[PDB]
Design a protein around this ligand. Structure first.
Ligand SMILES: Nc1ncnc2c1ncn2[C@@H]1O[C@H](COP(=O)(O)OP(=O)(O)OP(=O)(O)O)[C@@H](O)[C@H]1O
Ligand SMILES: Nc1ncnc2c1ncn2[C@@H]1O[C@H](COP(=O)(O)OP(=O)(O)OP(=O)(O)O)[C@@H](O)[C@H]1O
Ligand SMILES: Nc1ncnc2c1ncn2[C@@H]1O[C@H](COP(=O)(O)OP(=O)(O)OP(=O)(O)O)[C@@H](O)[C@H]1O
Ligand SMILES: [Mg+2]
Ligand SMILES: [Mg+2]
Ligand SMILES: [Mg+2]
Lengths: 56, 476, 471, 475, 121
């Protein structure tokens, strides 16, 4: 039982550590796509400002 | 002099030469016979937005000056009809004897003239009447994505006003004209159409008629408020009005701004939304509550029209599409919806139960947002998760079936005081159904005290009533 | 003097200079007949539509055929009226260009035929009707989640390559055989290949006798593409008014009407809006869509497709047209890549006909409970990507279990698919659909392998597939 | 009828005069470089200049050719390398074509065309099995940098031999080394005998980038109207779109999505629907066109990819992720589809090659779900084993075109499962030694497929599989 | 409001508080006036002269030798992201800032001010 409870706390420690690694990787990919989407929106806005400025 | 010649006719706009004594917002009449609203008084040519069909007009035509300014017909005759913003009937049933006319644009009531908002506008929608209360004179946005429940909530409001006096109005801007017909027949079928006016501008209509529709609707509402009767105005989509302004301004060659919306937009909506009031006893005690709606694109926020309107209105309800497709109806997020007037408007019985319900649901909103993913938690949190799940299931409701306030407080009281622990989450929409029948078979005195007193009945007798019903109801 | 002169050319746009007092009204049409006078020139016959006045007697006009060859000082005549379509009984079985001339090799229309304006005001509120009932059409998802409406506008929304035209061809194969009414098929922004394939499909089935057809194509200049939609609609309008039959209208791709407006608007001379579109987006698109209405006189049902400019629905042209449609189908690329066809978005499909009065209680409960399971499955997909499947329990385990099977069983073998793939197609009754999805939600067949549920008609066919795979 | 230049705006110019000009007319300056009149405002003509523009100065003189965008075409052109104006750049000599076609042609109408009756045999296993081509179809080949697009284009053009299958390769915005390396690869394989090559390169100004596809199809139209088959490759259309954006913004036209004008759909559509399969009344010719587009980081959801994908009758998507994982080449099954399938294939292929692509797509999504969790045996067994064996069967090496008879035999052995007992690296040794075995032992079946164009009788097709069990190795 | 508070400091020479109810509306009124005047936007559409106008206002609030005009101002932060130009331009001028968070207000503890996020000199 002592080895079982110790190995449980090891198994949870490693499983929670790996799960944290998976959460971190996903956050990275999402941040890259969010930055790309925001920069695309801002560059469209700037293109509208130029199109207004020459049209008037 | 005051007769002029047209020198462009494109796109639903015109330009004209002459008209020296013209005024901003004046009416000018074309030789074809339709008339236009002068809106840019530039250095040598007058801009003239055209109402009605524009296809007949040609350059070289003449415009005469009507001398009048924009006015709406008003009377008691309009109640029960469907009408055009210019004031004409479009429903059959013949002409309407409107005794007099009011201006479209005029000054609102001053700061002194108003009073505090202290009497409720009961809607029959449990999650609003409990958690986001409305009081007469309040202005509150409902903003959500398409197909979430903007018009169903409006219609439940107009249907519930049979029991308490309200000369309600409903303005449809840009709509598909067959949808307007489905709405009107729904108001007729629920027996509710004879105390209300419906104003229609359909999608086919030329741009200025979409733009002027809420201004004329409120011009109809305020006459009844000056008489002293409570009023309610609904604008079915303000965003389509804003878009009609954009297209009208861009064709007029006005310097644009964010997106391309002209810089005047916030002023134009404030001119619309600050006529709503609760006049003082010296002025008659009336009201003009307003419910504007805005459709956000994909859960967009921080955009130009939504941030403008969210700054103007004294509260906002936010509807979530991912809530709707998860079974909560009407879907209302308690987390992002706020009412600055709230607490004061509610009846005293409701104030006691609805104040604690806000605390309960806020506490579980955070605990569930993170701790639901893990299977097992602390006992005290499993209890708070159970209470929150029952709370959201007990706040689900049907379509076009308003619940009177008397039986709302008795279900919310049963929820907060924890009488629903024994009953399973799936069976609750049946616990409500079988309980409200029991509450009309027994307990009429409780409801009568609440009806006029606005007061919670003695807690001994209320618990005796709920315990007897819990004897009758059969658990799955 | 009613003859004019071209003064400027700028591509699709041309600017005429009529003498004073004879300016044509907006939407009138003008003719170009020019003798090729010298060895340098090219002869042309072209017609122009007036779209604005611009002062000093100038009018700005859209050409209906390519402007290659035009010269400053060359003459323009005035027809006096809108682009005039010949309509009546003789139209059925014929194919027209946008201008109302036949192209089908069979012959030319008798000159005695009444010919009608394309531009006229929409039907009013007193004239409409709202008696609403199911246009039962055998496409398993559309028969469940978003039931189509007899006499109502129906919309297909998708990106390029997702499967809109295959769905329209299955709809013609199911409906247009039994409808018993005039069908008008108009090609706007249409591939010329699909036009030929359809004309041979209609002849091989004999269906061409009752229907009539108008075509414009991707290779046409934008003015023709815009005014094909209006020329097709004017035909359907005459048949539902004068003859009083129910009418079926198909428009092949209505987005290309708005896009062609976007091209020709900047040259016309009016500032951009939210992403380069013309100012008058919603008014002119609403003007067209508000004509397509089922008055009391006789119903139209109209099935449309709209290409979303990218896989982005927040774009102005999709956004303005989402309001006008009673039943809308959203086709999404991500599902199609999984191989689920037709790629229909279960969560975002909306139709007015869903309502316990219109469908009945048995059918309603099932539409909502199925949408509820798929929405929970989207929530579980994220957390299983972090923790895994092994960590879910109870109500979360069975949602992923049943949402896989339901997501596959909404896929069906179309009767038009037999050319892309060797398979035979099916027709499924509504009752078999509602019983089937009920049976999947109950879980009676949970043991069958999830492979079996793909591209199938009824639960009996799924049992037969699973038996051959060793159940 | 004489006019003078009055601006010189970095390749655009404008002129005052030219009183009788007509849109599209060629004007040629005293320099001798050609100019294309686009717009005619009330006072001046907008003249795009083709060729070296640096030698132009204000007050230069403009004279008229009298003709509308005429590109020379004749039999004398075959074999040579020319620019889009039709002038030779290979230095072999002059070109003696007698007459000219227009750059601007109205496409054939709905009544003129026909269903696609016959295949165009690439010899590439993955194309001919999964995503077949037939004469007069237009099909997009799309991918990122260094993914093998030209290797597929040159494989297809080199595989066409015994047929009178005239072919064209158009280089748009391409490095002169790469164009010269292939004009020598086509000479090496002798395939340069019948093809024509048109080159416009990056140093050339944008006017000569955007026109080059129109000259490629204008050359094809002479042959297709006469009655012969054709094939066109455009080496990249995304550079044509970029050249149009650059020209449009040198003019004063307002941008749209990603600064591209809306005119980008009409440009490509005016390019691609001249490709056709004419009917007997017209003369039965054909003009299949294979355009290419370059994706940036695989973004098939961007504007120009979807713009072109709406116009074309299919797509092939070539994947970097598989390619740099050693699968030279790889096709992404779920993204690549042909809308003319079945009609184009031979009947034997319809019997063997029907459902295979949806089998791959199901394998791709099962692989994703297989990452997260446990699986069922009959799904693991059927769809992952067959999916891996399918991708391993369809991989093929450089410059080895395979005749259709041998593809039909391996596709039959895959779909009916006759090879499922042989795994992994043994499968590509299996299918090599299978072809090396049947080359001399399959004469009856091979002539049967060549003449009858149908799947052979299953008892002798099984005779091939039976003998290959004896011939093939233990492993 | 500034010109009134300035008379009381300069003549009476005593501490005169100036309260401004929300300056977010003030920045937006400037953005709309610039667009009406026909200037070109920047950032999230705020006018070019954002820091100049706000500085012109904020710098008069001071403690010169006569006395004081200490001011307490409130700001709406549109969407709980503080990088929007009107808050970000305001943040440099302010001496001490306390952040109000809705979660505490709904918890019913008031005035809702976050202990961890509040800072002063
Ligand atoms: N309380 C409710 N319970 C169940 N379904 C509801 C409820 N309220 C609305 N719905 C459903 O909402 C759908 C239509 O919503 P609604 O008619 O309110 O349009 P909307 O969401 O306001 O969008 P729009 O403004 O475009 O009309 C129908 O399926 C209807 O049954
Ligand atoms: N029900 C189906 N069964 C099998 N394959 C299908 C089905 N629906 C579509 N497809 C396939 O998906 C593609 C659909 O082609 P389709 O002609 O519908 O494109 P599209 O979306 O109409 O393009 P566009 O928007 O430009 O008209 C083809 O590859 C077709 O084989
Ligand atoms: N099937 C193949 N087998 C072996 N080698 C190959 C194969 N395909 C391509 N390669 C090698 O990889 C190189 C890259 O492919 P390719 O040159 O066609 O690039 P690309 O994607 O066309 O880029 P670009 O358009 O810039 O030429 C080829 O030149 C060749 O050297
Ligand atoms: Mg609505
Ligand atoms: Mg199509
Ligand atoms: Mg290459």
């Amino acid at each position: 039982l002592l080895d079982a409870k110790a190995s449980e706390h090891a198994a949870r420690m490693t499983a929670m550590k790996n799960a944290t690694d998976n959460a971190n990787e996903l956050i990275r990919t999402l941040t890259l796509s969010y930055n790309r989407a925001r920069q695309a929106a801002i560059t469209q806005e700037i293109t509208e400002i130029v199109a207004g400025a020459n049209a008037l | 002099s005051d007769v002029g010649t047209v020198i462009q006719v494109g796109d639903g706009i015109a330009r004209a030469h002459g008209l020296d004594n013209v005024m901003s917002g004046e009416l000018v009449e074309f030789a074809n016979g339709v008339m236009g609203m002068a809106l840019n008084l530039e250095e040598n040519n007058v801009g003239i937005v055209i109402l009605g069909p524009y296809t007949g007009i040609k350059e070289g035509d003449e415009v005469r000056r009507t001398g009048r300014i924009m006015e709406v017909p008003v009377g008691e005759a309009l109640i029960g009809r469907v009408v055009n913003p210019l004031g004409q009937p479009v429903d059959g049933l013949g002409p309407v004897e409107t005794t007099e006319t009011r201006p479209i644009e005029s000054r609102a009531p001053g700061v002194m003239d108003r009073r505090s908002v202290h009497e409720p506008l009961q809607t029959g929608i449990k999650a609003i009447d409990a958690l986001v209360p409305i009081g007469r004179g309040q202005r509150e946005l409902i903003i959500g994505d398409r197909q979430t429940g903007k018009t169903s909530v409006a219609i439940d409001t107009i249907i519930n006003q049979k029991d308490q006096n309200m000369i309600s109005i409903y303005v449809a801007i840009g709509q598909k004209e067959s949808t307007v017909r489905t709405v009107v027949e729904t108001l007729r079928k629920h027996g509710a159409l004879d105390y209300t006016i419906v104003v229609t501008a359909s999608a086919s209509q030329p741009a200025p008629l979409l733009f002027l529709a809420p201004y004329a609707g409120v011009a109809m509402g305020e006459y009844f408020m000056y008489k002293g009767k409570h009023v309610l105005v609904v604008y079915d989509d303000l965003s389509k009005q804003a878009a009609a302004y954009r297209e009208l301004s861009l064709l007029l060659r006005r310097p644009p701004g964010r997106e391309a919306y002209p810089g005047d937009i916030f002023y134009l909506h404030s001119r619309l939304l600050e006529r709503a009031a609760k006049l003082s006893d010296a002025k008659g005690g009336g009201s003009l509550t307003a419910l504007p709606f805005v459709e956000t694109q994909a859960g967009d926020i921080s955009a130009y029209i939504p941030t403008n309107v969210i700054s103007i209105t004294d509260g906002q309800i936010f509807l979530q599409s991912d809530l709707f497709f998860s079974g909560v109806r009407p879907a209302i997020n308690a987390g992002l919806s706020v009412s600055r007037v709230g607490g004061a408007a509610q009846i005293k019985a409701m104030k006691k139960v609805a104040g604690t319900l806000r605390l309960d649901l806020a506490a579980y909103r955070e605990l569930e947002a993170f701790a639901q993913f893990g299977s097992d938690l602390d006992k005290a949190t499993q209890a708070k998760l159970a209470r929150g799940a029952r709370t959201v299931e007990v706040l689900k409701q049907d379509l076009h079936q308003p619940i009177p306030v008397e039986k709302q407080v008795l279900i919310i009281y049963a929820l907060t005081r924890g009488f629903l622990d024994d009953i399973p989450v799936e069976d609750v929409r049946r616990f409500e159904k079988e309980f409200y029948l029991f509450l009309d078979q027994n307990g009429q005195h409780l409801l009568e005290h609440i009806r006029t007193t606005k007061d919670l009945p003695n807690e001994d007798d209320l618990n005796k009533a709920i315990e007897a019903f819990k004897k009758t109801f059969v658990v799955s | 003097m009613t003859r004019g002169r071209v003064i400027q050319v700028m591509g699709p746009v041309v600017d005429v200079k009529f003498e004073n007092g004879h300016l044509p009204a907006i939407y009138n049409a003008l003719k170009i007949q020019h003798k090729a006078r010298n060895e340098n020139e090219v002869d042309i016959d072209l017609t122009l539509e007036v779209a604005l006045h611009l002062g000093d007697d100038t009018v700005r006009t859209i050409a209906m055929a390519s402007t290659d060859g035009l010269i400053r000082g060359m003459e323009v005549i005035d027809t006096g009226a809108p682009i005039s379509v010949p309509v009546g009984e003789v139209t059925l079985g014929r194919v027209f260009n946008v201008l109302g001339e036949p192209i089908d090799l069979e012959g030319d229309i008798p000159a005695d035929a009444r010919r009608d304006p394309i531009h006229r005001p929409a039907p009013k509120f007193e004239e409409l009707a709202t008696e609403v009932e199911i246009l039962e059409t055998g496409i398993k998802v559309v028969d469940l989640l978003a039931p189509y409406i007899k006499g109502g506008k129906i919309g297909l929304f998708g990106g390029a390559g997702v499967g809109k035209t295959v769905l329209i061809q299955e709809l013609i194969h199911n409906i247009a055989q039994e409808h018993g009414g005039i069908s008008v098929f108009a090609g706007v922004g249409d591939r010329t290949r699909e036009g030929n394939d359809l004309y041979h499909e209609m002849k091989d089935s004999g269906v061409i006798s009752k229907t009539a057809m108008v075509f414009g194509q991707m290779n046409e200049p934008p003015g023709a593409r815009m005014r094909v939609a209006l020329t097709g609609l004017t035909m359907a309008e005459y048949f539902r008014d004068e003859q009083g039959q129910d009418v079926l209208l198909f428009i092949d791709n209505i987005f290309r009407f708005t896009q062609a407006g976007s091209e020709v608007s900047a040259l016309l001379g009016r500032m951009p809006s939210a992403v380069g579109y013309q100012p008058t987006l919603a008014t002119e698109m609403g003007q067209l869509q508000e004509r397509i209405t089922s008055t009391a006189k006789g119903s139209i049902t109209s099935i449309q497709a709209i290409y979303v400019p990218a896989d982005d629905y927040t774009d102005p042209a999709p956004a303005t047209t989402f309001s006008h449609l009673d039943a809308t189908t959203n086709l999404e690329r991500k599902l199609a890549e999984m191989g689920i066809y037709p790629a229909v978005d279960p969560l975002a499909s909306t139709s007015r006909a869903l309502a316990p009065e219109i469908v009945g209680e048995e059918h309603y409960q099932v539409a909502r409970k199925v949408q509820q399971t798929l929405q929970r499955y989207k929530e579980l997909q994220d957390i299983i990507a972090i923790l895994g499947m092994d960590e879910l329990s109870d109500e979360d385990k069975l949602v992923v279990h049943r949402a896989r099977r339901i997501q596959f069983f909404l896929s069906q073998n179309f009767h038009v698919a037999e050319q892309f793939t060797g398979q035979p197609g099916s027709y499924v009754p509504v009752k078999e659909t509602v019983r089937g999805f009920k049976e999947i939600l109950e879980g009676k067949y949970d043991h069958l392998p999830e492979d079996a549920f793909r591209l199938v008609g009824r639960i009996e066919e799924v049992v037969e597939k699973a038996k051959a795979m060793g159940v």
